[PDB]
Design a protein around this ligand. Structure first.
Ligand code: HEM
Lengths: 51, 435, 55, 418, 54, 101, 39, 47, 55
C-alpha cells in the first residue's frame, strides 16, 4: 500500500482526522446510550439519577 | 529578471480627477497604438421594469450620429483614421472604446466625448434601432449559453434589478421612446459615474488635458440571492445546458482571490481539449474519460455587493445527472479535503490568467476602467500576486465552506433536461453526510 | 469514475427500486398503503419470529 | 531591448525579445502544413496538430499534460495552410520547464498505435466544431477550387481519412518536414543564450531542408455546395501576387480600399466601397468584404459575400461591378490614403498583442528568414501608388476566376456568368 | 494438497480424545494450517514467479 | 547460473501450459494492467493469443493434451506481452507517484 | 509582414479553446464581421 | 423571447426573513437552515 | 413479435441466469458442486419442512 504513503495522503488524513474523531464520539455516546453501560453513565450528572 | 522583478517593473496606472468628478486614468507602455475608452457605471441593474431596455437601446444608437457629426459622418471619421470603435454594456457597466494610433489620441478622445455627451437620438434612427434590437432578441434566443445565463440571473436575483436582462423585454423595447432614452442618458451618463481610461502610447498629461478640454462641459439596493430553479424543458434541442451557482462575494470582498483559485482547481473542459483523460482537474478527467460533457466551465461573476459563483456545462440527455454529481462532489472536496499541491496548481493557473488577460492595449484599458468603476483603484499585478500567495489549502477549504458547503444554489436548465436532478436532490448534494 | 449507487449491482437494484424510481407526482395517500403492507409484512416476520422462540 | 535575430549553422533561426513582461511565450514555427501533404497522406497535418500531447521520448502524455498544467502554462498549435506553430506560454520562472516539453513534442515525437487510434475521433470532433460556422467550409472549398495541388489541401482531415491516418505517416511527415532549416524558435521574455542552448540541445539531430512540396498550380475551378441554409456564402477570387512582393502590398491596399471589415460596432461601413455598392440595390441583410490570402508561391484576391438565398446573385454582381469600376480607374487618392491608414493601423494592432507579435515574427522568420521592423513595413505600405491598386483591380477583373458557394444556391451565379 | 491433508488430520484429531499424541499432533496441524495459508503459499508463489522470469 | 537455467527449464516443463500449446504470457492473470496491455497489443499478436487460448480451452475441455512435438519449447517461448505490460505498469506507477505529491 | 493574418476577420476563423493542448487553424479574411447586424 | 419571461412572484410562499428583495439573504440563511435542521434533529431524537 | 424468454421480466431473469448464460466450455466437474449446493439447500428446506410438521 505504498501508493498511499505520500505527503498528500498525510495532508488528507489531517483534514479528516477531526471528522473521524467526531464520528467516533457519536459511536461512543451511542453505544453507552443504547446499552446503558452505567460504568460511564454514573459520571454523567443528570443521567446518573437513573440507577 | 525573475517573475517578481517583472511584476515590479510593470508601469503603474496614473489616475487624476476632473473638477466635475470624472476620473482620468492611463497606463503608458510606449507603443505606436493605444486604446482610449469611457466606462460608465450604468447598466441594467440601474433600470426598473418601465425602462429595462434603455441602456442597451442607447448603446445601440450611440454611434449612429451626434449633434456635431450627424448620421454616418462619425463612422467615416473613425474609419478614415483606421481606428476601431467598439462598445458593450453588461448588467452593471457600459463602455465605449476606440483602438487607434497614439498620434490619433486627441481626435479619438474628442469623438468619445461627442458619443457620451452630445448624442443625437433621431426618431427615424430610433425606430430603425428598435427593429434591429427586436431581431437581435430573436437571434439571441438561438445562443444557448446566453439564454441559460440570463435564466440563472432571473431566478437567482428574482424580484431585484439584477434579474433583468441587459436587452430587456421585447415589449419594453417597443414601448421605449426618445424621452425615456434621453432621461436615462441624463440620469446615468454623469461625470462622477464615468471613467476615461487609456492604455498604450498615451501620455497621462496629454489625456488629462484632452479630458479637461472636452469632458469639462459635463454635468457635475443590495440584491437578494434566492435559491431557486428555472427549467425550460425542450426535448427538441440537441444538448442540455445547465448553469448552477451560489451566492458569491462582491468586487471588494477579498474572498474573490481564493475562490477563483478554487475554480482554477475545478478547471474547465471542452470536447476539443487535447488534454483528455490526463487533465489535472479530476472533474475534467472524468468528463473526458466518460464522455460526460461536451464543455463545462466554472465561473465567478461578481457584482457590487453580490455575485454568482458556480459552473455551466453542456451535456447529453443521459449524462446531466452524472455530471452534476461529479461537479457537486468537486465542490465538496474543496470544502472538506483540499490539498496543497492542487492549491499551488490553482494559484499558478490564476497567476497565468491574470498576466495573460492583460496583454494588449484594449485589455489593459478594460481592466483600468472596470477596476476604477468597481474597486475605485487599479490593483497592480504585484498586489494580486501577494493576495494569491496568501492563499493556501486551509484558506481554500475555509472559503469554499463559507460559500459552497450546505448552501442553497440557483439552477438554470435548458433543453432535454429531464435527467437534471430535482432541486431537493441537488440541495442534498450541496452537503456531505460523511463530513 | 462512476457512482457506486448507480454502478454496484445491489446498489443498482436498490437505486432503481426506491431511490431514483420515477414516480407520479400526484399519487395521494392511498398509494402509501402498498409500502405499509411491506412494513406490516416485515413486522409480522420479526414479531412472529420472536413468538416462535417461546411457542 | 530589441529583437535578437540569429541564424544557426544548420539553418535554424532563433529570435528572442526581452520585454521584461511577467509572462514568457516561446513559439516554434515549422514550414509544415496542408500544403506539404500529398494525396496519400491527406489529413496527416491535422492529426499532427491534434497530437501535441501524445507520449514522447522525453516525457509521457500524462507527464506533459500534468507538468504544463501544474505551472499553469498553455501549449497550443496553430496550423495554417503552409505553416505550423507550436507555442508554450507561462510565467517567466517556469518557462524553461515548458521549453523542454515543447522540444519533446516536435523534435522527438513518439506516435504509439493505441494513442493515435484513440486520437482519431478527435479529428471528426474538431472538424465538426470548425465547420459549425460556414466560413470554414466555404474557404476549404475555395482553396480546393482555386488550386490544383499544395494549397488545395484543406486544414482539416478528409472524412474518409478520419480513421486511416497511420502512425507511420505521422513519423514520415515529422521526419521530412520538422527539420532545422524549416524551423524558427522565437521567444518573448527569454534570454537569447538560453534559447540558443535549448535549440542546440534538441533542434540539431534532423538535418535541414527537408522534403519540399511542389509549386501550387492555379486551377480556376468552382465548387458549389447545396446545404439549404438560408444565407448563401460565396467567395469569388482570382490569383493575386505571392506574399512579400510589392504587388502583394498593392493587393492589401486594394482590399482595404474595398473594405476588409467593420471599424464601428453595428456600423454601416460607410467607407467600405463594396458595402455601399451592394447596399444601393439590396435592402436585405447582407455582408460583403474583400478576401485576400497571401501565400509563399501564390495568392488569392476576391470578394466574400454573405447574402440572402434569393438575393445572392444581386449581391455578388454588385460587388464585382464595384471592383470593376475601381479597376477602370474610379479610385480617388483620398480613398487610397484612407486605406493605407487602415492597413497601417491594422498591422500595428495585430502586432500589438503578444500572440500577434509572436506570430508576426515567426512568419517573417519562416518566409523571409529575417525580421523587418514595423517602420519598414509601414514605409512599404505607403510606397503603394494608386496606379498599383488600379492594376491589382485590373488583374482581379481580367483573371481566371475560382468561386466557392454554400447555401440554398438556386439564384447564385456561376463563374462563367460573372 | 498438504493443506487438504492437514484439514483431514484436523478432522481426525477433533474426532479423537485429548491425550498424549493427539494434543501435539493437533497443535502442529493447526500451526501448519495457518502457516501454509499465510506464509508458505505467498512465498512459494513468489518463487514460482521468479522461476518464470516475471 | 547454469543450475538456475536448468531449474527454470525444469519448472517450465513442470508447469504444463506448454503442453497446451500456450505461451507464458497467455497464462497471466488479466488484471487492469494486463487488460490494458492486451488492448495495446498489435492485431496479429492479439489474434494469435486469442487462438492459442481458445485451443488451450478446447484441449482442457476434453482433458487431452497437445502432441509431444507441438508443446511450446522453453527456448522458443516469446514474452510478447511483457514490454506492453511493463510500459502500462510504468505509467500507472508514474500516475500514483504524481498522486502522492 | 508575411503572415496570413491580413485582416482581423478571417484568420483564426476556427480556433478551439484549450489548456495544455489547444489546436487552432487560420484561414484568410472571410467576412462575416458586421453580418450579425440583421437576422 | 427568453428576456420577456420573469420569475413569478413567490412572496406568498417566502419566509418572513426573505420577503424584502433589497435585503441580503446571507444573514438569514443561518437562521433558516438552523430552524429546518432543528426540526430534523428533534425528529431524529424522538425516533 | 418478440421472444417471451428474452422479453418477459421474470423470463428475462431466468434466461440470463440459467438458459443463455455464457459459460466457459472447459469447466470441470468441480464446478458442479455449486449447483449441488443449491440442490442440497432446496432439499434441506423441503425435507426440513416435512420434519417441522411433526417436530
Ligand atoms: C403475513 C405474515 C403473518 C401473519 C398475517 C400472521 C398472523 C398471525 C395471527 C393472526 C396469529 C394469531 C395470534 C393470536 O390469535 O393471538 C399469529 C400467531 C403466531 N404467529 Fe404469525 N403471522 C405472520 C407471520 C408469522 C411469522 C413469519 C412467524 C414466525 C417466524 C409467525 C409466528 C407466529 C406464532 C408462533 C404464532 C403463535 C403465537 C401466538 O399466537 O401468540 N407468524 N400469526
Amino acid at each position: 500500500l505504498s501508493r498511499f504513503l505520500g505527503p498528500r495522503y498525510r495532508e488528507l488524513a489531517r483534514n479528516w482526522i477531526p471528522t473521524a474523531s467526531m464520528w467516533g464520539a457519536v459511536g461512543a455516546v451511542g453505544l453507552v446510550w443504547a446499552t446503558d453501560w452505567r460504568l460511564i453513565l454514573d459520571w454523567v450528572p443528570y443521567i446518573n439519577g437513573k440507577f | 529578471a525573475t517573475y517578481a522583478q517583472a511584476l515590479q517593473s510593470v508601469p503603474e496606472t496614473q489616475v487624476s480627477q476632473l473638477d466635475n468628478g470624472l476620473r482620468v486614468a492611463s497606463e503608458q507602455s510606449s507603443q505606436p497604438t493605444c486604446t482610449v475608452g469611457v466606462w460608465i457605471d450604468a447598466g441594467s441593474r440601474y433600470e426598473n421594469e418601465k425602462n429595462n431596455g434603455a441602456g442597451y437601446f442607447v448603446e445601440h444608437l450611440a454611434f449612429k450620429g451626434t449633434k456635431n457629426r450627424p448620421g454616418s459622418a462619425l463612422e467615416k471619421e473613425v474609419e478614415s483614421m483606421g481606428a476601431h470603435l467598439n462598445a458593450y454594456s453588461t448588467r452593471e457597466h457600459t463602455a465605449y472604446y476606440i483602438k487607434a494610433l497614439s498620434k490619433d489620441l486627441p481626435k479619438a478622445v474628442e469623438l468619445l466625448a461627442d458619443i457620451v455627451q452630445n448624442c443625437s437620438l433621431e426618431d427615424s434612427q430610433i425606430e430603425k434601432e428598435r427593429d434591429v434590437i427586436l431581431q437581435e432578441l430573436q437571434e439571441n434566443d438561438s445562443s444557448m449559453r446566453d439564454v441559460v445565463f440570463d435564466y440563472l440571473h432571473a431566478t437567482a436575483f428574482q424580484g431585484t434589478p439584477l434579474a433583468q436582462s441587459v436587452e430587456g423585454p421585447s415589449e419594453n423595447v417597443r414601448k421605449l421612446s426618445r424621452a425615456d432614452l434621453t432621461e436615462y442618458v441624463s440620469q446615468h451618463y454623469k461625470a462622477p459615474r464615468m471613467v476615461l481610461a487609456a492604455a498604450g502610447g498615451v501620455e497621462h498629461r496629454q489625456l488629462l488635458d484632452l479630458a479637461q478640454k472636452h469632458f469639462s462641459s459635463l454635468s457635475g439596493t443590495p440584491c437578494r440571492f434566492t435559491g431557486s430553479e428555472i427549467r425550460h424543458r425542450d426535448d427538441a434541442l440537441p444538448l442540455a445546458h445547465v448553469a448552477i451557482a451560489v451566492e458569491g462575494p462582491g468586487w471588494a470582498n477579498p474572498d474573490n482571490v481564493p475562490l477563483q483559485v478554487a475554480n482554477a482547481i475545478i478547471g474547465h473542459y471542452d470536447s476539443t481539449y487535447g488534454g483528455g483523460t490526463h487533465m489535472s482537474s479530476t472533474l475534467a478527467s472524468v468528463a473526458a474519460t466518460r464522455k460526460l460533457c461536451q464543455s463545462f466551465q466554472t465561473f465567478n461573476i461578481c457584482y457590487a455587493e453580490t455575485g454568482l459563483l458556480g459552473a455551466h456545462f453542456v451535456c447529453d440527455n443521459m449524462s446531466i445527472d452524472d455530471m452534476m454529481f461529479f461537479l457537486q462532489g468537486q465542490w465538496m472536496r474543496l470544502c472538506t479535503s483540499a490539498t496543497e499541491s492542487e492549491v499551488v496548481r490553482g494559484k499558478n493557473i490564476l497567476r497565468n490568467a491574470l498576466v495573460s488577460h492583460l496583454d494588449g492595449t484594449t485589455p489593459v484599458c478594460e481592466d483600468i476602467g472596470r477596476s476604477l468603476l468597481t474597486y475605485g483603484r487599479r490593483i497592480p499585478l504585484a498586489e494580486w500576486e501577494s493576495r494569491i500567495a496568501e492563499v493556501d489549502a486551509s484558506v481554500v477549504r475555509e472559503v469554499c465552506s463559507k460559500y459552497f458547503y450546505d448552501q442553497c444554489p440557483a439552477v438554470a436548465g435548458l433543453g432535454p433536461i429531464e435527467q437534471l436532478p430535482d432541486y431537493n436532490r441537488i440541495r442534498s448534494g450541496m452537503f456531505w453526510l460523511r463530513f | 469514475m462512476t457512482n457506486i449507487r448507480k454502478s454496484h449491482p445491489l446498489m443498482k437494484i436498490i437505486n432503481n427500486a426506491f431511490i431514483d424510481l420515477p414516480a407520479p407526482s400526484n399519487i395521494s395517500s392511498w398509494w402509501n398503503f402498498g409500502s405499509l403492507l411491506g412494513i406490516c409484512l416485515i413486522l409480522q416476520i420479526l414479531t412472529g419470529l420472536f413468538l416462535a422462540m417461546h411457542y | 531591448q530589441d529583437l535578437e535575430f540569429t541564424r544557426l549553422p544548420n539553418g535554424l533561426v532563433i529570435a528572442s525579445l526581452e520585454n521584461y513582461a511577467p509572462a514568457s511565450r516561446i513559439g516554434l514555427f515549422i514550414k509544415a502544413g496542408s500544403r506539404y501533404e500529398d494525396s496519400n497522406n491527406l489529413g496527416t497535418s491535422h492529426l499532427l496538430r491534434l497530437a501535441s500531447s501524445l507520449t514522447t521520448k522525453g516525457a509521457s502524455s500524462f507527464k506533459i499534460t500534468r507538468g504544463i498544467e501544474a505551472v499553469g502554462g498553455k501549449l497550443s498549435v496553430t496550423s495554417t495552410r503552409e505553416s505550423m506553430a507550436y507555442t508554450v506560454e507561462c510565467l517567466r520562472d517556469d518557462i524553461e520547464i515548458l521549453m523542454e516539453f515543447l522540444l519533446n513534442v516536435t523534435a522527438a515525437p513518439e506516435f504509439r498505435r493505441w494513442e493515435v487510434a484513440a486520437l482519431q475521433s478527435q479529428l471528426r470532433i474538431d472538424k465538426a466544431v470548425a465547420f459549425q460556422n460556414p466560413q470554414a467550409q466555404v474557404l476549404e472549398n475555395l482553396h480546393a477550387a482555386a488550386y490544383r495541388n499544395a494549397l488545395a489541401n484543406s486544414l482539416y482531415c478528409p472524412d474518409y481519412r478520419i480513421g486511416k491516418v497511420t502512425p507511420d505517416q505521422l513519423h514520415y511527415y515529422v521526419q521530412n518536414h520538422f527539420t532545422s532549416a524549416r524551423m524558427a524558435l522565437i521567444g518573448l521574455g527569454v534570454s537569447h543564450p538560453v534559447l540558443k542552448q535549448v535549440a542546440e540541445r534538441f533542434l540539431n539531430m534532423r538535418g535541414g531542408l527537408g522534403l519540399s512540396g511542389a509549386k501550387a498550380k492555379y486551377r480556376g475551378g468552382e465548387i458549389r455546395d447545396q446545404n439549404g441554409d438560408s444565407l448563401v456564402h460565396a467567395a469569388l477570387v482570382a490569383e493575386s501576387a505571392a506574399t512579400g512582393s510589392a504587388e502583394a502590398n498593392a493587393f492589401s491596399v486594394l482590399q482595404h480600399v474595398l473594405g476588409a471589415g467593420p471599424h464601428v460596432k453595428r456600423g454601416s461601413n460607410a467607407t467600405s466601397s463594396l458595402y455601399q455598392a451592394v447596399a444601393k440595390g439590396v435592402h436585405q441583410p447582407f455582408d460583403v468584404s474583400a478576401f485576400n490570402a497571401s501565400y509563399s508561391d501564390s495568392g488569392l484576391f476576391g470578394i466574400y459575400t454573405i447574402s440572402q438565398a434569393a438575393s445572392a446573385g444581386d449581391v455578388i454582381k454588385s460587388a464585382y461591378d464595384q471592383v470593376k469600376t475601381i479597376a477602370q480607374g474610379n479610385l480617388s487618392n483620398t480613398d487610397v490614403q484612407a486605406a493605407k491608414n487602415k492597413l497601417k493601423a491594422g498591422y500595428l494592432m495585430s502586432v500589438e498583442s503578444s500572440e500577434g507579435f509572436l506570430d508576426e515574427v515567426g512568419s517573417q522568420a519562416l518566409v523571409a528568414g529575417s525580421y523587418v521592423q514595423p517602420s519598414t513595413v509601414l514605409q512599404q505600405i505607403d510606397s503603394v501608388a494608386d496606379a498599383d491598386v488600379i492594376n491589382a483591380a485590373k488583374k482581379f477583373v481580367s483573371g481566371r476566376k475560382s468561386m466557392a458557394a454554400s447555401g440554398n444556391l438556386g439564384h447564385t451565379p456561376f463563374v462563367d456568368e460573372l | 494438497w498438504m493443506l487438504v491433508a492437514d484439514l483431514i488430520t484436523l478432522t481426525w484429531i477433533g474426532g479423537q480424545p485429548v491425550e498424549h499424541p493427539f494434543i501435539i499432533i493437533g497443535q502442529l496441524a493447526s500451526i501448519l494450517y495457518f502457516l501454509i495459508i499465510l506464509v508458505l503459499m505467498p512465498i512459494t508463489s513468489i518463487i514460482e514467479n521468479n522461476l518464470l522470469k516475471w | 547460473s547454469k543450475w538456475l537455467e536448468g531449474i527454470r527449464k525444469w519448472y517450465y516443463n513442470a508447469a504444463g501450459f506448454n503442453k497446451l500449446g500456450l505461451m507464458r504470457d497467455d497464462t497471466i492473470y488479466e488484471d487492469d494492467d494486463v487488460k490494458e496491455a492486451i488492448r495495446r497489443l498489435p492485431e496479429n499478436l492479439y489474434n494469435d493469443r486469442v487462438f492459442r487460448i481458445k485451443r488451450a480451452l478446447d484441449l482442457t475441455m476434453r482433458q487431452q493434451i497437445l502432441p509431444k512435438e507441438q508443446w511450446t519449447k522453453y527456448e522458443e517461448d516469446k514474452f510478447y506481452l511483457e514490454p506492453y505490460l511493463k510500459e502500462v505498469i510504468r505509467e500507472r506507477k508514474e500516475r500514483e507517484e504524481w498522486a502522492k505529491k | 509582414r508575411h503572415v496570413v493574418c491580413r485582416f482581423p476577420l478571417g484568420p483564426f476563423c476556427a480556433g478551439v479553446v484549450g489548456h495544455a493542448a489547444l489546436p487552432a487553424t487560420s484561414e484568410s479574411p472571410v467576412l462575416d464581421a458586421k453580418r450579425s447586424f440583421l437576422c | 423571447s427568453h428576456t420577456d419571461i420573469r420569475v413569478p412572484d413567490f412572496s406568498d410562499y417566502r419566509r418572513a426573513e426573505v420577503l424584502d428583495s433589497t435585503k441580503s439573504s446571507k444573514e438569514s440563511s443561518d437562521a433558516r437552515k438552523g430552524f429546518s435542521y432543528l426540526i430534523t434533529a428533534t425528529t431524529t431524537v424522538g425516533v
